[PDB]
Amino acid sequence: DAKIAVYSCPFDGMITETKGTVLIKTAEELMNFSKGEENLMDAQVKAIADTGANVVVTGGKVADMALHYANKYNIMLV
Amino acid sequence: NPKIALLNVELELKAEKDNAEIRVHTVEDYQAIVDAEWNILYDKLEKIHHSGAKVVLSKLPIGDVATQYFADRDMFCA
């Protein structure tokens, strides 16, 4: 009864800020991104009440962080 | 039963240096500059050898002086 959460590309690829011409030198942009994805799928397992989505589809890459987030949330993402 | 280290970055002569300027205060002070020229490299080699590997490989050329400090680590590099 997985009332699908329908999206085209709910996730994006790899990026990294440059402080100027040269690249940034901090990992906060990655830690905050990971925690944001975690809380987004926490809100997903909240919004299963009004959506009922055990599955979702994307055209954008996700990482193994999303893999174990899904495993603890019991969801699938193509 | 050697554990192996799989490196590509190297330590070699003339590759890197610090453009430090220090006014004379004594004769024991100039060694701060020559220290800063190599201290990060010494700590880098010490820790990467203490990583848990016990023989190390590198795709780029390594210095004989670096090989001698690796022998001080009771270790060898290729």
Binding site: - | N19, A20, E21, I22, R23
Partner: protein, 88 residues
């Protein structure tokens, strides 16, 4: 980060203008010591007030301004030199 210029240029120019102001204050001290060196009346200013009473009492703030300028400005010259040397 090569932030030296953005942190040393303004300090250099302001130290230069403060040294010029201290030199002009020394010139004013010399002037009041020879020009209009009349004991009886001399308008001399402390912040926002004239008192036209001080002739020898002028040094009571002449030296104050002299040292409060010179010590702070050469200390901050050492500070900007420190900003220079920490990067190079």
């Amino acid at each position: 980060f090569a932030r030296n210029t953005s942190r040393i240029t303004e300090l250099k120019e302001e130290i230069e203008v403060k040294k010029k102001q201290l030199q002009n204050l020394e010139d004013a001290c010399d002037d009041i010591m020879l020009a209009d060196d009349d004991c009886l009346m001399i308008p001399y200013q402390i912040g926002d007030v004239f008192i036209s009473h001080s002739q020898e009492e002028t040094q009571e703030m002449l030296e104050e301004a002299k040292k409060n300028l010179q010590e702070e400005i050469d200390a901050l010259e050492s500070r900007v030199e420190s900003i220079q040397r920490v990067l190079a």
